[PDB]
Design a protein around this ligand. Structure first.
Ligand SMILES: C[C@]12CCc3c(ccc4cc(O)ccc34)[C@@H]1CCC2=O
Ligand SMILES: C[C@]12CCc3c(ccc4cc(O)ccc34)[C@@H]1CCC2=O
Lengths: 125, 125
C-alpha cells in the first residue's frame, strides 16, 4: 500500500539523505532488485550493490538539493522537480532534474529515473 | 534523432494547441500507435482514434494551461511541470501535473503519461 503521503514522505527522506550525505539512508529506501537510470538513456544500475556504488560516487561532492514544487503522487508513482547544487573548484553548478520513482507494494522504490539534459545544467561564471 | 530543442518545441506546441482548443493540432503530435495514460494508473488510450476521442472531451471545458518550469529533455524523452486551470459550476480549479513524453525517431510522441493526484488538485482561485 502506497498512499500519496507515504510516497511524498519517501521523497522528502530522499532529499534529506542526499543533503546529509547519508549513503545508507538513501539505499535503505530502495528495494533489493530496484533499478536506477540516472540520467535517462544510460545503462540502468540494477540491485542494492550497483545502486550503492552509484550513490557513493555521486556523494563524492557534498550536495545541496531542494524540492522546487509540490510532489506529484498517484498510483504507486511519484514525480518531483528539484535542484542539485555543488561547487567544483570555483565552479558552482546547479542541475535541475525531474525524478520519477515507482514504488512497490511494500512501499520501497523499485525504479528511479532521473530526467535532465544539457539544457537543465546551469552554473554561472 | 531527437534534440532537446525539438522535444521542447513539441511541448510548447502542445500547451498552445491545448490553450487554443486545437484538437487536430494535438492529435498531430502523436504517432499512429501512440498511447495516452491520463492519469497514471487509469486505462491507457491507444491509437489516434482513442487519443482524439480523449482530447475531444478534455477540451469540452476551455483550459488555461501554463508551463511552470523549464522542460527537461534528454534521450528521446521529455518531462515538464505545468498547471491546467478551468471552471465548472462557478468554481475555479487548478490541476498541477507533471507530464512525461517519449518520442520516436520521427520526432513524434509515442507515449504520454500524466502524473497528478488528489494532492495536485487545488481550488486555488
Ligand atoms: C551526478 C551529479 C550529482 C548528483 C545528481 C546529478 C543529477 C541528477 C541526480 C538525481 C538524483 O536523484 C540524485 C543525484 C543526482 C548530478 C549530475 C552531475 C553531478 O555531479
Ligand atoms: C482532464 C482535465 C482537462 C485536461 C487535463 C487535465 C489534467 C492533466 C492534463 C495533462 C495533459 O497533458 C493534457 C490535459 C490534461 C485535467 C484533469 C481535470 C480536467 O478537466
Amino acid at each position: 500500500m502506497n498512499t500519496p503521503e507515504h510516497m511524498t514522505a519517501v521523497v522528502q527522506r530522499y532529499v534529506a539523505a542526499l543533503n546529509a550525505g547519508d549513503l545508507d539512508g538513501i539505499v535503505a529506501l530502495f528495494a533489493d532488485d530496484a533499478t536506477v537510470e540516472n540520467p535517462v538513456g544510460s545503462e540502468p544500475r540494477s540491485g542494492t550493490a550497483a545502486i550503492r556504488e552509484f550513490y557513493a560516487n555521486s556523494l563524492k561532492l557534498p550536495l545541496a538539493v531542494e524540492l522546487t514544487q509540490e510532489v506529484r503522487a498517484v498510483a504507486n508513482e511519484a514525480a518531483f522537480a528539484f535542484i542539485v547544487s555543488f561547487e567544483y573548484q570555483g565552479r558552482k553548478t546547479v542541475v535541475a532534474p525531474i525524478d520519477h520513482f515507482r514504488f512497490n507494494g511494500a512501499g520501497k522504490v523499485v525504479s528511479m529515473r532521473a530526467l535532465f539534459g544539457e539544457k537543465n545544467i546551469h552554473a554561472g561564471a
